[PDB]
C-alpha cells in the first residue's frame, strides 16, 4: 500500500506496475515459444506428427 | 539436305546420304498413347517378339540387324543392312509383317518373350529412378488421358496380356493408312519405292484405326517417397507445346537457356547459366537437365534433377523456379543468343548422327504427323529468327503463374507442398 491503507501511493505504483508486467509477459511468451519450437505442436490424434508435415 | 516422300498404295519416305550402312523399316503412327489401362504394354510386348531370338537369327544369317522403338505417338520396326543388301531387308520386313504374323506368336516364344519383358520392366521400376520419375511425370501430368500411359506398360496389365491382345492390336493398328515405311543410310529413293512396288497387294487397306479423346494437362503431383534410396530424384514441368506448333522452337530454345548441368564435370560448372551461381554455393544437386518434350496432342516443359543435398531441396526448386520467372520479365539478349548457338549445336548432333536407325526414327515420326521432314537448314533459319521478345510472350502463356506437374522418388521429405512450389511460378508486383 505504501501507507495506512489503499490511497494515492497505492494507485500510482499500481499504474507503474500495470505498465511493466505486460512487457514481462511478452518476454515470458518468447520463452513459451522457444519451448514450443524444439518439439513442435502436438495434434488431435495425440501421436507423432513426424510422418506428415506441412509448412 | 535431301528428304523425299512419295505415296503409292502406302506412303514411303527416304533420306539417303552416302555413308556406311543403310536401314529400312516400317514406322506405325500409333503407340503407347493408343493403348488402354488394361492392355497397356502391348506395344512394348510386340517390340520384344520382333526382337526375339527366333526372329533375330533369321535376319542375322541374312546379314541384317533388327532395331525396334516404342514411343507415345508412334511405333517402329527397323532393319539395318549393308548398302547393297537393300533388298535383303524388305524381304525380311515383309516376311515378319505378313508371312510370320501367324508364327512368332506361337507359344513357347510368346511365353519366353513375356517372361523376359516382365523382368525387364521389373528391373526398370526398381533401378532406373530418373526415367521412372519422368514416366510418372507423364502419368500424373496427363492422368486419365492417352498421354498418361507409360511406354513399357504397367507391370500388371502386362501379365494379363495374351497372344489375342497382341493380335487385336496389330489388326487394329498395324494398318496401311496408319503406317510409313522409311529408308535412311545410303540407299537411293527410286531404289526403295520400286522394290516396294514390286510385290503388289495391300493387306487391310481402306481400314482406319479406332480414334479416341484428346490428351489434356492437369496441375497435379505424384510423390513416390523412398527413404531407403541414397538420393532424391525429381522432375517438374508445365504444359508444353505439341510438335507442329508456332512455338515448337521458341519453347525448345527456352529450355536450352537453363540447359543441363553435371556438378562433377568441371566444364559444366563453367557454363554461362545464371542459375549455376545460385546452385553451386551449397551444391544444391548432383545434376539436372531441362527439356521440351513435344507430342501430337500436348507436351511438357520443365526440368529433371537428382540431388544428395536432401535438406535443401526447397532451395533447388526455389532458385530454379525464380530463374524461369526471368523468361517473362528479364531474359537478357545474350542469354537468347547463347541459346541459339547451343540449340543449333545439339539439334545438329541429333539429326546429323552416324547411325541411320536414329535418322529413321526422326524421319518417320515427323512425316507421320506433319507429312514431311523439316530440313535442318530450315530449322536454323527459324531459330535465328527468335527474339528476346518472342521468348517472353511464350513464357507469359506457358510459364507465368501456370499449374505444374511434379513427380519424385527417394528422400523427398524436403520437397515442399504443391502449393508452395506452385506459388514460385511468379513474382510480386506493384
Amino acid at each position: 500500500w505504501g501507507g495506512f491503507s489503499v490511497s494515492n501511493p497505492t494507485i500510482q505504483r499500481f499504474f507503474a506496475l500495470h505498465y511493466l508486467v505486460p512487457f514481462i509477459i511478452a518476454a515470458m511468451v518468447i520463452m513459451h515459444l522457444m519451448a514450443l519450437h524444439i518439439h513442435g505442436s502436438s495434434n488431435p490424434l495425440g501421436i507423432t506428427g513426424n510422418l506428415d508435415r506441412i509448412p | 539436305a535431301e528428304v523425299t516422300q512419295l505415296s503409292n498404295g502406302i506412303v514411303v519416305a527416304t533420306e539417303h546420304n552416302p555413308a556406311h550402312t543403310a536401314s529400312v523399316g516400317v514406322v506405325f503412327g500409333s503407340g503407347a498413347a493408343n493403348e488402354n489401362p488394361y492392355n497397356n504394354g502391348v506395344s512394348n510386348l510386340w517390340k520384344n517378339i520382333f526382337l526375339s531370338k527366333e526372329n533375330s537369327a533369321v535376319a542375322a544369317k541374312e546379314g541384317l540387324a533388327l532395331s525396334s522403338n516404342i514411343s507415345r505417338d508412334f511405333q517402329s520396326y527397323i532393319v539395318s543392312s549393308l548398302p547393297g543388301s537393300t533388298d535383303k531387308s524388305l524381304d525380311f520386313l515383309n516376311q515378319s509383317f505378313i508371312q510370320q504374323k501367324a508364327n512368332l506368336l506361337s507359344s513357347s516364344n510368346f511365353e519366353a518373350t513375356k517372361k523376359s519383358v516382365l523382368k525387364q520392366v521389373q528391373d526398370f521400376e526398381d533401378n532406373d529412378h530418373p526415367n521412372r520419375v519422368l514416366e510418372h511425370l507423364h502419368s500424373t501430368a496427363f492422368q486419365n488421358t492417352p498421354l498418361s500411359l507409360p511406354t513399357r506398360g504397367t507391370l500388371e496389365s502386362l501379365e494379363n496380356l495374351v497372344v489375342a491382345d497382341l493380335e487385336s492390336f496389330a489388326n487394329n493398328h498395324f494398318l496401311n493408312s496408319n503406317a510409313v515405311v522409311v529408308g535412311t543410310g545410303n540407299i537411293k529413293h527410286e531404289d526403295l519405292v520400286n522394290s516396294i512396288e514390286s510385290k503388289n497387294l495391300s493387306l487391310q487397306t481402306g481400314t482406319k484405326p479406332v480414334l479416341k479423346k484428346k490428351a489434356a494437362f492437369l496441375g497435379s503431383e505424384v510423390r513416390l517417397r523412398d527413404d531407403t534410396l541414397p538420393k532424391a530424384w525429381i522432375s517438374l514441368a508445365v504444359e508444353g507445346e505439341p510438335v507442329n506448333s508456332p512455338n515448337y522452337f521458341v519453347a525448345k530454345l527456352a529450355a536450352q537457356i537453363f540447359g543441363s548441368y553435371n556438378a562433377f564435370e568441371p566444364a559444366s560448372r563453367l557454363q554461362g547459366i545464371k542459375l549455376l551461381d545460385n546452385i553451386q554455393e551449397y551444391q544444391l544437386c548432383d545434376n539436372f537437365n531441362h527439356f521440351s518434350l513435344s507430342y501430337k496432342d500436348s507436351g511438357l516443359w520443365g526440368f529433371s534433377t537428382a540431388t544428395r543435398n536432401v535438406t535443401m531441396i526447397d532451395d533447388l526448386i526455389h532458385f530454379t523456379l525464380k530463374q524461369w520467372n526471368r523468361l517473362t520479365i528479364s531474359v537478357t539478349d545474350t542469354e537468347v543468343e547463347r541459346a541459339k548457338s547451343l540449340l543449333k549445336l545439339q539439334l545438329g548432333q541429333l539429326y546429323e548422327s552416324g547411325n541411320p536407325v536414329n535418322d529413321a526414327n526422326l524421319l518417320g515420326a515427323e512425316v507421320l504427323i506433319k507429312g514431311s521432314k523439316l530440313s535442318l537448314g530450315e530449322a536454323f533459319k527459324k531459330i535465328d529468327a527468335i527474339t528476346v521478345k518472342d521468348v517472353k510472350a511464350w513464357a507469359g502463356k506457358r510459364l507465368w503463374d501456370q499449374d505444374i506437374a511434379i513427380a519424385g522418388t527417394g528422400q523427398i521429405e524436403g520437397l515442399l507442398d504443391y502449393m508452395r512450389i506452385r506459388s514460385d511460378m511468379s513474382m510480386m508486383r506493384w
Side-chain angles (χ1 to χ4, degrees):
Chain A
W1 288 342
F4 292 151
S5 52
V6 177
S7 64
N8 200 222
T10 338
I11 307 307
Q12 285 195 323
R13 78 185 56 206
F14 276 172
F15 170 58
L17 264 20
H18 180 54
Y19 202 142
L20 198 250
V21 199
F23 294 104
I24 294 180
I25 291 182
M28 273 304 99
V29 155
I30 304 169
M31 308 190 79
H32 187 63
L33 287 207
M34 287 166 74
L36 174 65
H37 193 75
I38 72 184
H39 289 122
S41 263
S42 186
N43 60 251
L45 303 189
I47 59 181
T48 188
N50 292 335
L51 294 65
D52 189 47
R53 283 318 229 281
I54 56 175
Chain B
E2 293 308 299
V3 181
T4 33
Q5 190 177 29
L6 276 179
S7 52
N8 230 328
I10 321 171
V11 56
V12 185
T14 55
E15 193 179 44
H16 56 301
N17 268 264
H20 355 92
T21 61
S23 298
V24 182
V26 55
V27 184
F28 298 106
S30 292
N34 306 267
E35 306 186 3
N36 313 111
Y38 313 102
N39 88 136
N40 192 25
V42 71
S43 291
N44 181 45
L45 201 44
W46 263 109
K47 175 218 189 75
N48 285 268
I49 73 153
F50 178 94
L51 303 172
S52 175
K53 181 178 183 178
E54 244 186 59
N55 223 26
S56 290
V58 177
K61 300 197 178 193
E62 211 72 34
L64 287 8
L66 310 173
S67 302
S68 183
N69 177 205
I70 305 298
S71 284
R72 303 197 130 80
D73 281 342
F74 69 84
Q75 195 160 157
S76 68
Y77 297 91
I78 299 174
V79 177
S80 301
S81 55
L82 270 331
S85 304
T86 181
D87 246 70
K88 242 79 268 295
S89 294
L90 288 172
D91 286 327
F92 181 88
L93 244 304
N94 198 273
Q95 184 189 57
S96 299
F97 275 101
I98 280 181
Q99 183 270 88
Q100 281 197 90
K101 226 55 181 179
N103 299 86
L104 295 173
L105 290 177
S106 58
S107 182
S108 298
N109 187 69
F110 179 85
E111 290 301 310
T113 301
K114 179 185 172 176
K115 196 198 280 70
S116 287
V117 316
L118 221 62
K119 182 199 175 192
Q120 191 194 112
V121 165
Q122 186 191 290
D123 255 276
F124 172 96
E125 203 67 33
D126 257 64
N127 305 301
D128 194 356
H129 308 105
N131 287 283
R132 168 181 144 217
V133 165
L134 194 49
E135 203 72 290
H136 277 93
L137 201 275
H138 278 99
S139 167
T140 187
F142 298 128
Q143 59 165 88
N144 280 227
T145 254
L147 250 31
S148 79
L149 281 333
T151 56
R152 313 91 196 306
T154 88
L155 214 167
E156 291 113 68
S157 66
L158 241 63
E159 49 182 36
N160 191 244
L161 258 40
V162 294
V163 187
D165 291 299
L166 275 281
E167 303 193 292
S168 303
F169 194 79
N171 284 326
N172 282 250
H173 290 288
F174 299 164
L175 302 175
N176 199 46
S177 62
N178 183 64
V180 171
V181 53
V182 189
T184 57
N186 88 328
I187 56 105
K188 292 184 176 65
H189 183 52
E190 274 143 70
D191 261 44
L192 192 67
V193 67
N194 287 327
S195 292
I196 292 180
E197 197 170 22
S198 178
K199 312 87 173 183
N200 220 248
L201 199 68
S202 297
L203 199 282
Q204 285 190 284
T205 187
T207 314
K208 59 182 185 67
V210 199
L211 47 161
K212 325 151 302 171
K213 275 316 215 66
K214 352 80 174 181
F217 187 85
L218 183 73
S220 52
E221 71 172 32
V222 49
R223 311 168 98 102
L224 327 154
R225 197 225 240 227
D226 185 345
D227 290 5
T228 71
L229 290 171
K231 302 185 188 185
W233 300 255
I234 93 160
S235 294
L236 180 162
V238 303
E239 173 163 60
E241 299 272 8
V243 305
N244 203 50
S245 154
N247 305 125
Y248 179 77
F249 294 104
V250 181
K252 223 158 223 299
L253 179 113
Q256 194 55 239
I257 294 182
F258 305 120
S260 306
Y261 160 82
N262 179 168
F264 295 110
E265 279 283 323
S268 187
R269 302 195 300 237
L270 291 166
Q271 299 181 61
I273 293 186
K274 305 204 170 303
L275 173 76
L276 293 169
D277 288 341
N278 299 129
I279 88 93
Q280 301 204 56
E281 192 175 24
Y282 291 88
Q283 207 48 81
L284 267 39
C285 58
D286 282 345
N287 61 253
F288 79 85
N289 72 287
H290 286 253
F291 55 77
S292 175
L293 275 40
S294 290
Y295 305 109
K296 212 224 302 171
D297 297 327
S298 206
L300 289 176
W301 189 106
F303 82 135
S304 296
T305 159
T307 174
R308 269 160 43 240
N309 191 196
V310 301
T311 77
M312 300 181 80
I313 299 179
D314 58 278
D315 288 315
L316 211 213
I317 301 308
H318 181 49
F319 288 135
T320 304
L321 274 56
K322 284 293 95 178
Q323 278 303 139
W324 289 1
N325 297 165
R326 303 189 49 242
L327 298 176
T328 305
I329 58 185
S330 75
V331 70
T332 72
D333 228 291
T334 104
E335 278 181 299
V336 168
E337 280 314 305
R338 184 207 104 112
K340 292 181 184 177
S341 307
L342 281 190
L343 210 193
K344 293 184 177 178
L345 178 77
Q346 68 118 16
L347 196 58
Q349 295 183 271
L350 214 185
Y351 290 19
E352 297 171 13
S353 172
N355 193 348
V357 305
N358 284 189
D359 299 306
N361 268 121
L362 281 181
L363 217 176
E366 268 204 85
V367 311
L368 234 181
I369 306 164
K370 47 210 295 184
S372 49
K373 180 177 183 172
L374 183 51
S375 62
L376 187 56
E378 274 292 295
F380 292 16
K381 292 195 177 184
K382 283 193 182 304
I383 292 180
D384 288 311
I386 304 176
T387 59
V388 161
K389 200 182 181 181
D390 282 329
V391 180
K392 297 188 182 183
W394 175 80
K397 250 68 163 65
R398 260 64 191 97
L399 238 39
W400 195 266
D401 195 30
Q402 289 302 329
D403 268 332
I404 56 183
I406 313 180
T409 197
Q411 290 167 264
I412 48 159
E413 167 176 88
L415 175 76
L416 263 48
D417 59 282
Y418 184 83
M419 270 310 231
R420 254 288 203 111
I421 304 183
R422 170 67 231 264
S423 297
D424 266 326
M425 290 311 314
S426 43
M427 307 183 62
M428 303 287 284
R429 287 193 280 207
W430 189 266

